[PDB]
Design a protein around this ligand. Structure first.
Ligand SMILES: N[C@@H](CCC(=O)N[C@@H](CSSC[C@H](NC(=O)CC[C@H](N)C(=O)O)C(=O)NCC(=O)O)C(=O)NCC(=O)O)C(=O)O
Length: 508
Protein backbone atom coordinates (compact mmCIF):
# COMPACT_ATOMS: atom_id res chain seq x y z
CA UNK A 1 0.00 0.00 0.00
CA UNK A 2 1.74 3.17 1.23
CA UNK A 3 5.35 1.97 1.45
CA UNK A 4 8.13 4.49 2.09
CA UNK A 5 11.52 3.33 0.80
CA UNK A 6 14.41 4.85 2.74
CA UNK A 7 17.75 4.16 1.09
CA UNK A 8 20.56 4.17 3.65
CA UNK A 9 24.31 3.90 3.13
CA UNK A 10 25.24 1.24 5.71
CA UNK A 11 23.91 -1.64 7.81
CA UNK A 12 23.19 -0.67 11.42
CA UNK A 13 25.62 -1.63 14.18
CA UNK A 14 22.61 -2.85 16.18
CA UNK A 15 18.91 -2.39 16.99
CA UNK A 16 19.20 -1.71 20.74
CA UNK A 17 19.57 2.02 21.35
CA UNK A 18 20.89 1.65 24.93
CA UNK A 19 23.84 -0.35 23.56
CA UNK A 20 24.99 1.92 20.72
CA UNK A 21 25.74 5.52 19.96
CA UNK A 22 25.56 6.16 16.21
CA UNK A 23 22.89 7.63 13.95
CA UNK A 24 22.49 4.73 11.50
CA UNK A 25 21.63 2.45 14.40
CA UNK A 26 19.32 5.00 16.04
CA UNK A 27 17.54 5.73 12.75
CA UNK A 28 16.96 1.98 12.26
CA UNK A 29 15.63 1.41 15.79
CA UNK A 30 14.79 4.07 18.39
CA UNK A 31 13.69 6.69 15.83
CA UNK A 32 11.07 4.29 14.43
CA UNK A 33 10.04 1.76 17.07
CA UNK A 34 10.71 3.27 20.54
CA UNK A 35 9.35 6.20 22.54
CA UNK A 36 11.03 8.23 25.28
CA UNK A 37 9.37 9.79 28.36
CA UNK A 38 9.51 13.15 26.58
CA UNK A 39 10.20 13.82 22.89
CA UNK A 40 11.08 16.70 20.57
CA UNK A 41 8.44 18.30 18.34
CA UNK A 42 9.30 17.52 14.70
CA UNK A 43 11.88 19.86 13.18
CA UNK A 44 12.37 21.48 16.58
CA UNK A 45 14.41 21.40 19.82
CA UNK A 46 11.26 22.09 21.83
CA UNK A 47 10.15 19.19 24.00
CA UNK A 48 6.64 17.83 24.53
CA UNK A 49 4.99 14.98 26.47
CA UNK A 50 5.38 11.43 25.16
CA UNK A 51 5.31 8.36 27.44
CA UNK A 52 5.21 10.81 30.34
CA UNK A 53 1.91 12.67 29.89
CA UNK A 54 2.98 15.33 32.39
CA UNK A 55 5.59 15.96 35.08
CA UNK A 56 6.57 18.21 37.96
CA UNK A 57 9.96 19.40 39.13
CA UNK A 58 10.70 20.28 42.76
CA UNK A 59 11.80 23.82 43.62
CA UNK A 60 15.37 22.67 44.31
CA UNK A 61 15.52 21.06 40.86
CA UNK A 62 16.43 17.65 42.30
CA UNK A 63 13.14 15.71 42.11
CA UNK A 64 11.40 14.98 38.80
CA UNK A 65 8.06 13.18 39.03
CA UNK A 66 6.61 11.68 35.85
CA UNK A 67 2.93 10.91 35.36
CA UNK A 68 2.87 8.12 32.80
CA UNK A 69 0.41 7.88 29.92
CA UNK A 70 -2.28 5.20 30.23
CA UNK A 71 -3.59 2.91 27.48
CA UNK A 72 -0.23 2.66 25.70
CA UNK A 73 0.28 -0.61 23.79
CA UNK A 74 3.61 -2.33 23.06
CA UNK A 75 4.19 -4.14 19.77
CA UNK A 76 4.01 -7.91 19.30
CA UNK A 77 6.22 -10.32 17.38
CA UNK A 78 6.34 -14.10 16.87
CA UNK A 79 8.25 -14.46 20.17
CA UNK A 80 6.14 -12.13 22.35
CA UNK A 81 2.65 -10.67 22.76
CA UNK A 82 2.23 -8.17 25.62
CA UNK A 83 -0.37 -8.95 28.28
CA UNK A 84 -0.41 -5.45 29.77
CA UNK A 85 -0.07 -1.79 28.77
CA UNK A 86 3.03 0.33 29.33
CA UNK A 87 3.63 1.22 32.99
CA UNK A 88 6.24 2.20 35.58
CA UNK A 89 7.96 -1.21 35.53
CA UNK A 90 9.04 -0.53 31.93
CA UNK A 91 10.60 2.82 32.84
CA UNK A 92 12.38 1.37 35.89
CA UNK A 93 13.72 -1.53 33.81
CA UNK A 94 15.01 0.80 31.09
CA UNK A 95 17.00 2.92 33.57
CA UNK A 96 18.12 0.19 35.95
CA UNK A 97 19.50 -2.10 33.25
CA UNK A 98 22.10 0.58 32.53
CA UNK A 99 22.51 2.02 36.04
CA UNK A 100 22.86 -1.18 38.10
CA UNK A 101 25.86 -3.42 37.26
CA UNK A 102 24.02 -6.31 38.91
CA UNK A 103 20.73 -5.87 37.07
CA UNK A 104 19.86 -9.19 35.35
CA UNK A 105 20.16 -7.55 31.90
CA UNK A 106 23.26 -5.43 32.55
CA UNK A 107 25.60 -7.84 30.75
CA UNK A 108 23.15 -9.22 28.20
CA UNK A 109 24.59 -8.81 24.68
CA UNK A 110 27.80 -7.70 26.44
CA UNK A 111 26.22 -4.24 26.65
CA UNK A 112 28.42 -1.22 27.50
CA UNK A 113 25.89 1.70 27.59
CA UNK A 114 28.18 4.23 25.85
CA UNK A 115 25.83 7.24 25.84
CA UNK A 116 24.54 6.56 29.37
CA UNK A 117 28.21 6.89 30.35
CA UNK A 118 28.99 10.00 28.26
CA UNK A 119 25.91 11.69 29.78
CA UNK A 120 27.23 10.82 33.26
CA UNK A 121 23.86 9.42 34.33
CA UNK A 122 25.57 7.06 36.81
CA UNK A 123 26.67 9.98 38.96
CA UNK A 124 23.67 12.16 38.06
CA UNK A 125 20.96 9.72 39.15
CA UNK A 126 20.46 9.18 42.88
CA UNK A 127 17.39 7.00 42.34
CA UNK A 128 14.77 5.95 39.82
CA UNK A 129 11.73 4.65 41.66
CA UNK A 130 8.27 3.36 40.91
CA UNK A 131 5.81 5.41 42.96
CA UNK A 132 2.86 3.51 41.53
CA UNK A 133 1.82 1.82 38.27
CA UNK A 134 1.62 5.15 36.43
CA UNK A 135 4.12 7.33 38.32
CA UNK A 136 7.92 7.40 38.40
CA UNK A 137 10.09 9.58 40.62
CA UNK A 138 13.66 10.36 39.60
CA UNK A 139 15.96 11.99 42.16
CA UNK A 140 19.19 13.69 41.10
CA UNK A 141 22.42 14.18 43.05
CA UNK A 142 22.81 17.62 41.43
CA UNK A 143 20.84 20.14 39.36
CA UNK A 144 20.65 19.59 35.61
CA UNK A 145 18.84 22.18 33.48
CA UNK A 146 19.14 19.78 30.53
CA UNK A 147 17.59 16.72 32.19
CA UNK A 148 14.14 16.91 30.53
CA UNK A 149 15.60 17.44 27.06
CA UNK A 150 18.14 14.67 27.73
CA UNK A 151 15.26 12.26 28.48
CA UNK A 152 14.25 12.72 24.84
CA UNK A 153 17.49 11.06 23.69
CA UNK A 154 17.53 7.66 21.96
CA UNK A 155 19.77 5.91 24.53
CA UNK A 156 17.04 6.26 27.18
CA UNK A 157 14.27 4.76 25.02
CA UNK A 158 11.71 2.80 27.03
CA UNK A 159 11.88 -0.96 26.55
CA UNK A 160 9.37 -3.64 27.62
CA UNK A 161 9.99 -5.14 31.06
CA UNK A 162 7.52 -7.94 30.25
CA UNK A 163 9.39 -8.80 27.03
CA UNK A 164 12.65 -8.84 28.99
CA UNK A 165 11.14 -11.14 31.64
CA UNK A 166 9.77 -13.55 29.05
CA UNK A 167 12.94 -13.74 26.95
CA UNK A 168 15.15 -14.21 30.00
CA UNK A 169 12.92 -17.05 31.19
CA UNK A 170 13.14 -18.62 27.73
CA UNK A 171 16.95 -18.50 27.89
CA UNK A 172 17.40 -15.95 25.10
CA UNK A 173 17.56 -12.47 26.68
CA UNK A 174 19.65 -11.13 23.78
CA UNK A 175 16.43 -11.25 21.75
CA UNK A 176 15.22 -7.92 23.17
CA UNK A 177 18.36 -6.31 21.74
CA UNK A 178 18.32 -7.86 18.25
CA UNK A 179 14.54 -7.91 17.86
CA UNK A 180 13.10 -4.66 19.24
CA UNK A 181 9.67 -4.35 20.82
CA UNK A 182 8.59 -0.80 21.69
CA UNK A 183 5.59 1.50 21.99
CA UNK A 184 6.71 3.60 19.02
CA UNK A 185 4.89 4.59 15.81
CA UNK A 186 6.39 1.74 13.75
CA UNK A 187 7.17 -1.84 14.73
CA UNK A 188 10.14 -3.99 13.70
CA UNK A 189 9.31 -6.49 10.93
CA UNK A 190 12.74 -8.02 10.38
CA UNK A 191 16.30 -7.50 9.18
CA UNK A 192 18.19 -9.23 6.36
CA UNK A 193 21.92 -8.66 6.75
CA UNK A 194 23.34 -6.12 4.28
CA UNK A 195 19.98 -5.93 2.46
CA UNK A 196 17.28 -4.13 4.47
CA UNK A 197 15.29 -3.75 7.65
CA UNK A 198 11.49 -3.50 7.49
CA UNK A 199 8.88 -1.78 9.66
CA UNK A 200 5.08 -1.56 9.83
CA UNK A 201 2.78 1.13 11.20
CA UNK A 202 1.82 0.31 14.79
CA UNK A 203 -1.94 0.42 14.28
CA UNK A 204 -2.59 0.95 18.00
CA UNK A 205 0.05 3.68 18.42
CA UNK A 206 -0.99 5.85 21.36
CA UNK A 207 -0.81 9.10 19.36
CA UNK A 208 -2.73 7.73 16.37
CA UNK A 209 -1.69 5.46 13.49
CA UNK A 210 1.00 6.72 11.11
CA UNK A 211 0.03 7.83 7.61
CA UNK A 212 2.71 5.53 6.18
CA UNK A 213 1.76 1.82 6.36
CA UNK A 214 5.13 0.24 5.59
CA UNK A 215 8.74 1.41 5.87
CA UNK A 216 11.75 -0.25 4.24
CA UNK A 217 15.31 0.79 5.09
CA UNK A 218 17.05 -0.53 1.98
CA UNK A 219 20.83 -0.70 2.38
CA UNK A 220 22.28 0.78 -0.81
CA UNK A 221 25.96 1.38 -0.10
CA UNK A 222 26.89 3.11 -3.38
CA UNK A 223 25.91 6.79 -3.45
CA UNK A 224 25.69 6.59 -7.26
CA UNK A 225 23.11 3.81 -6.95
CA UNK A 226 21.16 5.76 -4.32
CA UNK A 227 20.85 8.70 -6.70
CA UNK A 228 19.88 6.47 -9.64
CA UNK A 229 17.20 4.77 -7.54
CA UNK A 230 15.83 8.10 -6.29
CA UNK A 231 15.50 9.28 -9.89
CA UNK A 232 13.78 6.03 -10.90
CA UNK A 233 11.45 6.41 -7.92
CA UNK A 234 12.84 3.30 -6.22
CA UNK A 235 13.89 5.45 -3.23
CA UNK A 236 11.88 8.14 -1.43
CA UNK A 237 14.84 9.39 0.64
CA UNK A 238 18.60 8.91 0.35
CA UNK A 239 21.63 9.77 2.50
CA UNK A 240 25.08 11.24 1.74
CA UNK A 241 24.85 11.90 -2.02
CA UNK A 242 28.05 12.26 -4.06
CA UNK A 243 29.12 15.85 -4.72
CA UNK A 244 28.36 15.87 -8.46
CA UNK A 245 24.91 14.34 -7.94
CA UNK A 246 24.18 16.84 -5.18
CA UNK A 247 24.87 19.66 -7.63
CA UNK A 248 22.38 18.14 -10.06
CA UNK A 249 19.71 17.55 -7.42
CA UNK A 250 19.61 21.23 -6.45
CA UNK A 251 17.62 21.89 -9.62
CA UNK A 252 16.44 18.35 -10.46
CA UNK A 253 12.64 18.42 -10.92
CA UNK A 254 12.32 14.85 -9.63
CA UNK A 255 13.88 15.80 -6.28
CA UNK A 256 12.62 17.72 -3.27
CA UNK A 257 15.94 18.64 -1.67
CA UNK A 258 15.74 19.62 2.00
CA UNK A 259 18.74 21.35 3.53
CA UNK A 260 19.65 23.00 6.82
CA UNK A 261 22.78 24.07 8.65
CA UNK A 262 24.03 21.12 10.69
CA UNK A 263 24.13 21.15 14.48
CA UNK A 264 27.53 19.49 14.27
CA UNK A 265 31.32 19.90 14.21
CA UNK A 266 33.99 18.01 12.29
CA UNK A 267 37.36 18.22 14.01
CA UNK A 268 40.93 17.02 14.34
CA UNK A 269 41.47 15.82 17.92
CA UNK A 270 44.94 15.97 19.48
CA UNK A 271 45.77 13.43 22.19
CA UNK A 272 46.62 16.04 24.81
CA UNK A 273 48.09 13.37 27.10
CA UNK A 274 50.69 12.21 24.57
CA UNK A 275 53.89 14.07 23.68
CA UNK A 276 54.36 16.08 21.63
CA UNK A 277 50.64 16.94 21.60
CA UNK A 278 50.69 17.58 25.35
CA UNK A 279 52.45 20.89 24.62
CA UNK A 280 49.85 23.60 24.00
CA UNK A 281 52.34 25.36 21.69
CA UNK A 282 52.44 22.34 19.38
CA UNK A 283 48.63 22.15 19.31
CA UNK A 284 48.42 25.87 18.47
CA UNK A 285 51.10 25.45 15.78
CA UNK A 286 49.22 22.63 14.04
CA UNK A 287 46.15 24.90 13.98
CA UNK A 288 48.10 27.75 12.37
CA UNK A 289 49.46 25.26 9.84
CA UNK A 290 46.07 24.35 8.37
CA UNK A 291 44.24 26.18 5.56
CA UNK A 292 40.56 25.55 6.42
CA UNK A 293 39.31 27.41 3.39
CA UNK A 294 41.04 24.86 1.15
CA UNK A 295 39.21 22.09 3.03
CA UNK A 296 35.84 23.77 2.67
CA UNK A 297 36.46 24.06 -1.08
CA UNK A 298 37.89 20.58 -1.70
CA UNK A 299 35.99 18.45 0.82
CA UNK A 300 32.70 20.31 1.37
CA UNK A 301 32.52 21.98 -2.06
CA UNK A 302 31.06 25.01 -0.29
CA UNK A 303 28.34 23.05 1.53
CA UNK A 304 29.65 23.85 5.00
CA UNK A 305 31.53 26.56 6.83
CA UNK A 306 34.95 26.77 8.45
CA UNK A 307 34.53 26.28 12.20
CA UNK A 308 35.74 28.77 14.85
CA UNK A 309 34.20 27.04 17.88
CA UNK A 310 33.24 23.44 18.66
CA UNK A 311 29.67 24.78 19.01
CA UNK A 312 27.76 25.38 15.77
CA UNK A 313 26.77 28.97 14.85
CA UNK A 314 23.08 28.08 15.18
CA UNK A 315 23.05 27.02 18.84
CA UNK A 316 22.57 29.40 21.77
CA UNK A 317 25.69 30.17 23.79
CA UNK A 318 27.81 30.27 20.61
CA UNK A 319 30.60 32.86 21.02
CA UNK A 320 30.66 35.18 17.99
CA UNK A 321 33.72 37.13 19.17
CA UNK A 322 35.97 34.07 18.85
CA UNK A 323 38.13 33.86 15.74
CA UNK A 324 39.79 30.71 14.43
CA UNK A 325 43.56 30.46 14.30
CA UNK A 326 44.63 32.23 11.09
CA UNK A 327 46.26 30.20 8.32
CA UNK A 328 49.95 30.99 8.84
CA UNK A 329 52.67 28.40 8.20
CA UNK A 330 55.15 31.07 9.39
CA UNK A 331 53.53 31.26 12.85
CA UNK A 332 53.28 27.48 12.98
CA UNK A 333 57.04 27.11 12.40
CA UNK A 334 57.88 29.72 15.02
CA UNK A 335 55.77 27.94 17.65
CA UNK A 336 57.21 24.54 16.71
CA UNK A 337 60.69 26.02 17.13
CA UNK A 338 59.83 27.35 20.60
CA UNK A 339 58.49 23.89 21.48
CA UNK A 340 61.88 22.40 20.62
CA UNK A 341 60.87 21.08 17.20
CA UNK A 342 62.55 23.32 14.62
CA UNK A 343 63.37 20.11 12.76
CA UNK A 344 59.74 18.98 13.04
CA UNK A 345 58.71 15.45 13.96
CA UNK A 346 56.98 12.31 12.67
CA UNK A 347 53.45 11.29 13.67
CA UNK A 348 50.23 9.63 12.49
CA UNK A 349 46.93 11.11 11.41
CA UNK A 350 44.02 8.79 12.15
CA UNK A 351 41.38 8.69 9.42
CA UNK A 352 37.72 7.88 10.07
CA UNK A 353 36.64 4.97 7.81
CA UNK A 354 32.94 5.88 7.34
CA UNK A 355 31.05 9.03 6.39
CA UNK A 356 28.90 10.65 9.10
CA UNK A 357 26.94 13.91 9.30
CA UNK A 358 29.70 16.48 9.75
CA UNK A 359 32.21 15.51 7.06
CA UNK A 360 31.55 14.01 3.63
CA UNK A 361 35.16 12.81 3.16
CA UNK A 362 37.36 12.27 6.25
CA UNK A 363 40.18 10.77 4.17
CA UNK A 364 40.45 13.76 1.81
CA UNK A 365 40.34 16.12 4.81
CA UNK A 366 43.16 14.13 6.41
CA UNK A 367 45.20 14.26 3.19
CA UNK A 368 44.89 18.06 3.17
CA UNK A 369 45.88 18.41 6.82
CA UNK A 370 48.74 15.98 6.22
CA UNK A 371 49.98 18.17 3.37
CA UNK A 372 49.69 21.36 5.44
CA UNK A 373 51.60 19.84 8.36
CA UNK A 374 54.32 18.63 5.97
CA UNK A 375 54.99 22.27 5.02
CA UNK A 376 55.97 23.08 8.61
CA UNK A 377 58.13 20.00 9.08
CA UNK A 378 55.59 17.60 10.54
CA UNK A 379 55.56 14.35 8.55
CA UNK A 380 52.89 11.70 9.01
CA UNK A 381 51.36 8.43 7.90
CA UNK A 382 47.61 8.06 7.58
CA UNK A 383 46.28 5.32 9.87
CA UNK A 384 42.81 3.75 9.84
CA UNK A 385 40.82 0.79 11.16
CA UNK A 386 37.31 -0.56 10.67
CA UNK A 387 34.70 1.62 12.40
CA UNK A 388 34.16 -0.26 15.68
CA UNK A 389 37.89 -0.88 16.07
CA UNK A 390 38.70 2.72 15.12
CA UNK A 391 36.54 4.11 17.92
CA UNK A 392 37.59 1.52 20.51
CA UNK A 393 41.30 2.20 19.94
CA UNK A 394 40.63 5.94 19.93
CA UNK A 395 38.87 5.75 23.28
CA UNK A 396 41.81 3.82 24.73
CA UNK A 397 44.08 6.72 23.75
CA UNK A 398 45.99 5.03 20.93
CA UNK A 399 45.48 8.05 18.63
CA UNK A 400 48.03 10.77 18.06
CA UNK A 401 45.68 13.09 16.16
CA UNK A 402 42.63 12.10 14.14
CA UNK A 403 39.49 13.05 12.22
CA UNK A 404 36.20 12.79 14.15
CA UNK A 405 32.81 14.50 14.29
CA UNK A 406 29.85 15.14 16.57
CA UNK A 407 26.20 16.10 16.14
CA UNK A 408 24.25 17.44 19.14
CA UNK A 409 21.33 15.38 20.43
CA UNK A 410 19.31 17.50 22.89
CA UNK A 411 19.61 21.07 21.60
CA UNK A 412 21.76 22.23 24.52
CA UNK A 413 25.36 23.44 24.41
CA UNK A 414 26.20 21.21 27.39
CA UNK A 415 25.69 18.20 25.10
CA UNK A 416 28.58 19.50 23.02
CA UNK A 417 31.01 20.71 25.67
CA UNK A 418 30.64 18.04 28.38
CA UNK A 419 30.79 14.89 26.23
CA UNK A 420 33.61 16.32 24.14
CA UNK A 421 35.79 18.14 26.69
CA UNK A 422 34.77 17.17 30.24
CA UNK A 423 37.49 15.36 32.20
CA UNK A 424 35.00 12.68 33.30
CA UNK A 425 34.56 11.61 29.68
CA UNK A 426 38.17 10.75 28.92
CA UNK A 427 37.91 7.15 27.73
CA UNK A 428 34.30 7.73 26.63
CA UNK A 429 33.54 10.61 24.25
CA UNK A 430 36.43 13.01 25.00
CA UNK A 431 38.92 11.67 22.45
CA UNK A 432 41.45 14.48 23.01
CA UNK A 433 41.73 13.23 26.59
CA UNK A 434 41.36 16.88 27.62
CA UNK A 435 41.36 17.44 31.40
CA UNK A 436 41.09 21.07 32.44
CA UNK A 437 39.77 21.87 35.95
CA UNK A 438 38.89 25.46 35.01
CA UNK A 439 36.72 24.23 32.14
CA UNK A 440 35.20 21.50 34.32
CA UNK A 441 34.18 24.15 36.87
CA UNK A 442 32.55 26.31 34.18
CA UNK A 443 30.60 23.36 32.75
CA UNK A 444 29.54 22.12 36.20
CA UNK A 445 28.25 25.56 37.21
CA UNK A 446 26.43 26.21 33.93
CA UNK A 447 24.57 22.91 33.66
CA UNK A 448 22.56 23.51 36.85
CA UNK A 449 21.44 27.11 36.33
CA UNK A 450 17.88 28.06 35.35
CA UNK A 451 18.94 31.45 33.99
CA UNK A 452 19.70 30.78 30.32
CA UNK A 453 21.35 34.18 29.81
CA UNK A 454 23.85 33.33 32.56
CA UNK A 455 24.43 29.86 31.14
CA UNK A 456 25.22 31.49 27.79
CA UNK A 457 27.81 33.82 29.32
CA UNK A 458 29.54 30.84 30.93
CA UNK A 459 29.66 28.80 27.70
CA UNK A 460 30.99 31.87 25.91
CA UNK A 461 33.84 31.99 28.44
CA UNK A 462 34.36 28.24 27.97
CA UNK A 463 34.90 28.83 24.25
CA UNK A 464 37.63 31.37 24.99
CA UNK A 465 39.36 28.77 27.15
CA UNK A 466 39.00 26.10 24.47
CA UNK A 467 40.58 28.30 21.82
CA UNK A 468 43.55 29.10 24.06
CA UNK A 469 44.14 25.45 25.03
CA UNK A 470 43.57 24.15 21.47
CA UNK A 471 42.70 20.52 22.27
CA UNK A 472 41.41 20.38 18.68
CA UNK A 473 41.46 21.87 15.28
CA UNK A 474 37.84 22.96 14.79
CA UNK A 475 37.43 22.23 11.08
CA UNK A 476 33.87 22.65 9.81
CA UNK A 477 30.14 22.71 10.40
CA UNK A 478 28.37 20.89 7.56
CA UNK A 479 25.04 21.25 5.76
CA UNK A 480 22.51 18.42 6.35
CA UNK A 481 20.79 17.25 3.13
CA UNK A 482 17.68 15.11 2.79
CA UNK A 483 16.87 14.52 -0.89
CA UNK A 484 13.38 13.05 -1.29
CA UNK A 485 11.06 11.97 -4.08
CA UNK A 486 8.21 14.26 -5.14
CA UNK A 487 5.50 12.09 -3.56
CA UNK A 488 6.83 12.61 -0.02
CA UNK A 489 4.62 15.08 1.87
CA UNK A 490 5.00 16.94 5.16
CA UNK A 491 8.52 15.61 5.77
CA UNK A 492 10.72 17.57 8.19
CA UNK A 493 14.45 17.30 8.84
CA UNK A 494 15.38 16.74 12.49
CA UNK A 495 17.59 19.46 14.01
CA UNK A 496 19.91 16.63 15.13
CA UNK A 497 20.04 14.91 11.72
CA UNK A 498 17.76 11.91 12.40
CA UNK A 499 15.26 10.41 9.97
CA UNK A 500 11.92 10.59 11.80
CA UNK A 501 9.00 9.52 9.63
CA UNK A 502 5.90 9.58 11.84
CA UNK A 503 3.77 12.42 10.47
CA UNK A 504 5.19 12.14 6.95
CA UNK A 505 2.76 11.11 4.19
CA UNK A 506 2.86 9.75 0.65
CA UNK A 507 0.83 11.29 -2.18
CA UNK A 508 -0.53 9.53 -5.26
N1 LIG B 1 26.16 12.56 19.30
C1 LIG B 1 26.66 11.28 18.80
C2 LIG B 1 25.52 10.29 18.54
C3 LIG B 1 24.48 10.85 17.56
C4 LIG B 1 24.90 10.69 16.10
O1 LIG B 1 25.46 9.65 15.69
N2 LIG B 1 24.47 11.72 15.16
C5 LIG B 1 24.59 11.59 13.74
C6 LIG B 1 23.62 12.60 13.08
S1 LIG B 1 21.96 12.01 13.23
S2 LIG B 1 21.90 10.28 12.15
C7 LIG B 1 21.80 10.60 10.41
C8 LIG B 1 23.16 10.87 9.73
N3 LIG B 1 22.85 11.24 8.37
C9 LIG B 1 23.13 12.58 7.88
O2 LIG B 1 23.96 13.30 8.46
C10 LIG B 1 22.60 13.00 6.46
C11 LIG B 1 21.71 14.21 6.58
C12 LIG B 1 20.39 13.78 7.12
N4 LIG B 1 19.68 13.07 6.09
C13 LIG B 1 19.55 14.93 7.51
O3 LIG B 1 18.61 15.27 6.76
O4 LIG B 1 19.92 15.71 8.41
C14 LIG B 1 23.97 9.63 9.66
O5 LIG B 1 23.62 8.72 8.90
N5 LIG B 1 25.14 9.49 10.41
C15 LIG B 1 25.74 8.17 10.41
C16 LIG B 1 26.36 7.90 11.77
O6 LIG B 1 25.95 8.54 12.77
O7 LIG B 1 27.23 6.99 11.89
C17 LIG B 1 26.01 11.81 13.29
O8 LIG B 1 26.30 11.68 12.07
N6 LIG B 1 26.99 12.35 14.18
C18 LIG B 1 28.39 12.37 13.85
C19 LIG B 1 28.81 13.62 13.09
O9 LIG B 1 28.09 14.67 13.09
O10 LIG B 1 29.87 13.60 12.42
C20 LIG B 1 27.52 11.51 17.60
O11 LIG B 1 27.44 12.57 16.93
O12 LIG B 1 28.39 10.65 17.27
Amino acid sequence: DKTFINCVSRSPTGFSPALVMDGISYNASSQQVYNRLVEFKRGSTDIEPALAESWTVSDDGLTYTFNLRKGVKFHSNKEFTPSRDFNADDVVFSFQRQLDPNHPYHNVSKATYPYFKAMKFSTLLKSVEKVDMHTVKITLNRQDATFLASLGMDFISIYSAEYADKMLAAGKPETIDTTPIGTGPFLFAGYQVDQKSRYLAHKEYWKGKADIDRLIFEIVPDATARYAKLQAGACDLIDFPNAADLEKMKTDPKVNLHSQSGLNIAYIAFNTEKAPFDNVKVRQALNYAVDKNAIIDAVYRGAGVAAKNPLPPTIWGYNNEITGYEYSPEKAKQLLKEAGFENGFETDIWVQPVVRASNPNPRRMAELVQSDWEKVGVKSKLVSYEWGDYIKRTKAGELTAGTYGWSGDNGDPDNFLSPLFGSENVGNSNYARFKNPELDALLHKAVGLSDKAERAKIYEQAQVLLKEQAPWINVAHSINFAPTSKRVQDYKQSPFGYTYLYGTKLAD
